[PDB]
């Protein structure tokens, strides 16, 4: 299989400079007259095209963008940049590389994607309360920044991510047959990567 | 080149028909080729490309996928639907630079109605202990996504401070889940008792009522 794993730091600051890295594994990047995009993806879910470099190193720019982007590759590395100058909020976005389809201008094989947020807002790790009373269980995850927890537990649900003055909070719950808990452990782990913490909030009766 | 898709948003049974329209400004077809592709995505997951030249299906792609149009007419058919395809579904035309997008059309599954399972949960002693007071309700797997949720605070209704979320339609059982959350000081929580969330749906005539005293 090919697979594309895009990386670049999740929280910049406005003004600034994004910039992103793309490494393939499973095909080369200077195959077969295969061309490679940038793609960005809005908060509202609208998708913006910004450029591909093709296998022969040749680059097109979506216009609007063209005075503030740059897209090189390091073929050594099989890999893909894409870096952004003059930042706003208009900017924070999930930025996708794609491998486009053989007959070119549209995009059979995605990568993963990675969230830039531009803010100049501090980055605040969340406090993680459990939520104790089939039996249903929680985890409440309050007050951080930026964007990107994930919850998993030792039948989930996710509830999404809510902004207030300036923070997140968001919650997950679990359900399990009430022999199994508090008979056996349940613990929800939060990963914070921004903040680089994790929490392992063990629910108790 | 600025592509609009419609509906906003399609309601589909099990086995029925989805039909999703995309109108271009421009003719996109030389006559022959039509410069027209469809994928779809899933929430936190890349689009996946589905349908492109209009009418060419990805390798691995099902034949329950269709898709057709020309000039400025273009149509994606989704027959039968089955539940693993509730996604955003997009256009996209390669006619001149730069490549756009549709908007998207939001593909929910219909399935039979189910009530919701409600469960109560207090504010933990670590939260008290940092100042703030969150009661909170879930909601969960329940159809239609249409739901009531009231809070009672020692008997009578309260409305400030709620906050509720909904999950997106689980791909698995077409149900929605959705948590509402009250938010206190631990002053306001100290000096109140009897604490309740009321579910109203349509599944049941009587409503579903979880509580708990703050003893």
């Known amino acids: 299989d090919v697979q594309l794993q895009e990386s670049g730091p999740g929280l910049v600051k406005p003004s600034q400079t994004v910039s992103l890295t793309c490494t393939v594994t499973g095909i080369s990047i200077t195959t077969g007259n295969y061309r490679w995009s940038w793609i960005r993806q809005f908060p509202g879910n609208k998708l913006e095209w910004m450029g591909y470099?093709?296998?022969?190193?040749?680059?097109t720019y979506n216009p609007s963008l063209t005075s503030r982007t740059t897209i090189t590759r390091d073929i050594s590395r099989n890999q893909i940049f894409l870096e952004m100058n003059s930042l706003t909020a208009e900017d924070t976005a999930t930025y996708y590389c794609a491998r486009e389809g053989v007959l070119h201008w549209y995009f059979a094989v995605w990568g993963a994607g990675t969230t830039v947020t531009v803010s100049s807002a501090k980055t605040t790790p969340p406090s993680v309360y459990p939520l104790a009373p089939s039996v249903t269980l929680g985890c409440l995850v309050k007050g951080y920044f930026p964007e990107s927890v994930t919850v998993t537990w030792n039948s989930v649900h996710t509830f999404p991510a809510l902004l207030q003055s300036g923070l997140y909070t968001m919650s997950s719950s679990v359900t399990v047959p009430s022999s199994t808990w508090p008979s056996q452990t349940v613990t929800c782990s939060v990963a914070h990567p921004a903040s680089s913490t994790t929490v392992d909030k063990k629910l108790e009766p | 080149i600025v592509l609009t898709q419609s509906p906003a948003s399609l309601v589909v049974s099990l086995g029925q028909r989805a039909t999703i329209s995309c109108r271009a400004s421009?003719?996109?077809?030389?006559?022959?080729?039509?410069?027209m592709h469809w994928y779809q995505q899933k929430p936190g997951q890349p689009p996946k490309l589905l349908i492109y030249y209009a009418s060419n299906l990805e390798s691995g792609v099902p034949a329950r996928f269709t898709g057709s149009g020309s000039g400025t007419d273009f149509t994606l058919n989704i027959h039968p639907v089955e539940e693993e395809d509730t996604a955003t579904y997009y256009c996209?035309?390669?006619?001149?630079?730069?490549?756009?997008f549709g908007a998207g059309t939001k593909l929910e599954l219909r399935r039979a109605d189910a009530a919701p399972t409600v469960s109560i949960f207090p504010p933990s002693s670590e939260q008290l202990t940092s100042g703030g007071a969150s009661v909170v309700c879930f909601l969960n797997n329940f159809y239609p996504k249409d739901i009531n949720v009231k809070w009672k605070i020692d008997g009578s209704e309260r409305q400030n401070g709620v906050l509720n979320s909904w999950t997106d339609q689980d791909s698995k059982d077409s149900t929605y889940s959705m948590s509402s959350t009250l938010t206190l000081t631990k002053d306001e929580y100290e000096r109140h008792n009897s604490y309740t969330c009321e579910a109203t749906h349509k599944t049941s005539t009587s409503p579903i009522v979880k509580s708990f005293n703050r003893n």
């Open positions: 470099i093709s296998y022969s190193d040749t680059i």
């Open positions: 421009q003719t996109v077809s030389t006559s022959s080729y039509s410069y």
């Open positions: 996209q035309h390669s006619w001149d630079i730069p490549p756009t």
